[PDB]
Design an enzyme around this catalytic site. Structure first.
Site, short mmCIF file in Angstrom:
data_model
loop_
_atom_site.label_atom_id
_atom_site.label_comp_id
_atom_site.label_asym_id
_atom_site.label_seq_id
_atom_site.Cartn_x
_atom_site.Cartn_y
_atom_site.Cartn_z
N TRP A 13 -1.92 5.34 -5.29
CA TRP A 13 -1.26 6.40 -4.46
C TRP A 13 -1.05 5.92 -3.14
O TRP A 13 -1.91 5.48 -2.41
CB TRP A 13 -2.05 7.38 -4.37
CG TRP A 13 -1.60 8.85 -3.85
CD1 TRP A 13 -0.68 8.92 -2.80
CD2 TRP A 13 -2.34 10.00 -3.99
NE1 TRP A 13 -0.41 10.19 -2.48
CE2 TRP A 13 -1.59 11.07 -3.11
CE3 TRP A 13 -3.28 10.56 -4.96
CZ2 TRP A 13 -1.80 12.36 -3.17
CZ3 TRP A 13 -3.65 11.86 -4.70
CH2 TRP A 13 -2.97 12.91 -3.92
N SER A 54 -11.79 3.09 -7.02
CA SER A 54 -10.79 2.61 -6.20
C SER A 54 -10.80 2.55 -4.65
O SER A 54 -10.43 3.22 -3.60
CB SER A 54 -9.20 3.58 -6.47
OG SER A 54 -8.22 3.13 -6.15
N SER A 63 -2.87 0.88 -4.75
CA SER A 63 -4.22 0.50 -5.60
C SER A 63 -4.08 -0.12 -6.72
O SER A 63 -5.04 -0.95 -7.21
CB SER A 63 -5.11 1.74 -5.86
OG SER A 63 -5.75 2.16 -4.39
N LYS A 94 -5.12 -3.69 -6.84
CA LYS A 94 -6.50 -4.14 -7.02
C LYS A 94 -6.67 -5.07 -8.15
O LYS A 94 -7.43 -6.10 -8.18
CB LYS A 94 -7.51 -2.80 -7.22
CG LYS A 94 -7.69 -2.38 -5.90
CD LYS A 94 -9.03 -1.32 -6.10
CE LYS A 94 -9.45 -0.76 -4.78
NZ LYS A 94 -8.61 0.30 -4.52
N1 LIG Z 1 -5.75 4.43 0.29
C1 LIG Z 1 -5.33 4.50 -0.62
C2 LIG Z 1 -4.81 4.93 -2.00
C3 LIG Z 1 -5.25 6.35 -2.27
C4 LIG Z 1 -6.91 6.59 -2.41
C5 LIG Z 1 -7.70 5.39 -3.04
N2 LIG Z 1 -7.54 6.00 -4.43
O1 LIG Z 1 -6.63 5.36 -5.36
S1 LIG Z 1 -5.95 6.04 -6.61
O2 LIG Z 1 -6.59 7.15 -7.04
O3 LIG Z 1 -6.27 5.09 -7.64
O4 LIG Z 1 -4.54 5.91 -6.38
C6 LIG Z 1 -7.01 4.00 -3.03
N3 LIG Z 1 -5.53 3.95 -2.68
C7 LIG Z 1 -4.79 3.27 -3.51
O5 LIG Z 1 -3.81 3.82 -4.18
CL LIG Z 2 -6.45 -0.67 -2.89
#
Ligand SMILES: N#C[C@@H]1CC[C@@H](NOS(=O)(=O)O)CN1C=O
Ligand SMILES: [Cl-]
Length: 244
Positions: free
Chosen positions: A190, A97, A50, A53
């Site tokens: 993540w 996110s 993420s 983004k």
């Molecule tokens: N799919 C996926 C992952 C994990 C779940 C969402 N949340 O992102 S995060 O908390 O910033 O890492 C979006 N994403 C981005 O890293």
């Molecule tokens: Cl993303």
């Protein structure tokens, strides 16, 4: 008057206590400092997940694929998280996110333009392959913690090759915390669809005096870990070092 030995030991213990392996890279002026319990991660490549983004939003805004007020409607299909089952702007989707919003944006941009822009910015290994809507989640796009902190340094100082306004709009989306007069701008990541899983928190501190201190935290996530460990280790490290 705290020794660098003690700072290094402290920051290492934060990663040790979370029972993972990671690094946090801090940049002051031109100098990189690497801390944590797995320093060798600093120049290894991982999927940005993420954290992408930030660049996806820059690309979309610059190329008129969205505006900052545009509401991306929820299509009514079930999402991984209930919080994503709603209509949102890019900024709201940044904070939550919300992958589906950013996937729609990537699809508007399209593969050809996305490859050109990722290449132009020189982000990580610059390879997005053939699937416009997941290349930052499962490969082939990869980036190092050093590259991530340098990207954050560029964005913080308006040095990326985008309009000043584009950079300012995206930076407004990234404010996650205020601590005793310092502001923390960052994006978490993540990579759940790769093994091992990678966790990120990349951004910068804007101090009261206007000075900006970029950072990138990178660690291994395990099934069962809380996402907030990324934030907790980062704030403890920045506090230990007197950055906040
Ligand atoms: N799919 C996926 C992952 C994990 C779940 C969402 N949340 O992102 S995060 O908390 O910033 O890492 C979006 N994403 C981005 O890293
Ligand atoms: Cl993303």
């Amino acid at each position: 008057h705290i020794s660098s030995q003690q700072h290094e030991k402290a920051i290492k213990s934060y990663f040790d206590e979370a029972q993972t392996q990671g690094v946090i890279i801090i940049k002051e002026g031109k100098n990189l400092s690497t801390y944590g319990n797995a320093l060798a991660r600093a120049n290894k490549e991982y999927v940005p997940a993420s954290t992408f983004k930030m660049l996806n939003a820059l690309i979309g805004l610059e190329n008129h694929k969205a505006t900052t007020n545009e509401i991306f409607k929820w299509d009514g299909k079930k999402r991984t998280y209930p919080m994503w089952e709603k209509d949102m702007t890019l900024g709201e989707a940044m904070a939550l996110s919300a992958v589906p919003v950013y996937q729609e944006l990537a699809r508007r941009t399209g593969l050809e333009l996305m490859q050109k822009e990722v290449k132009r910015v020189n982000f990580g290994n610059t390879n997005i392959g053939t699937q416009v809507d997941n290349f930052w989640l499962v490969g082939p796009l990869k980036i190092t913690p050093v590259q991530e902190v340098n990207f954050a340094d560029d964005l913080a100082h308006n040095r990326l090759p985008f309009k000043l306004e584009t950079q300012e709009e995206v930076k407004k989306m990234l404010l996650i915390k205020e601590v005793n007069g310092s502001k923390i701008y960052a994006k978490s990541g993540w990579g759940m669809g790769v093994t091992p899983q990678v966790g990120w928190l990349t951004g910068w501190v804007e101090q009261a005096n206007g000075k900006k201190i970029p950072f990138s935290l990178n660690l291994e996530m395990k099934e069962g870990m809380s996402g907030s460990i990324r934030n907790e280790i980062t704030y403890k490290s920045l506090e230990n070092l007197g950055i906040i």
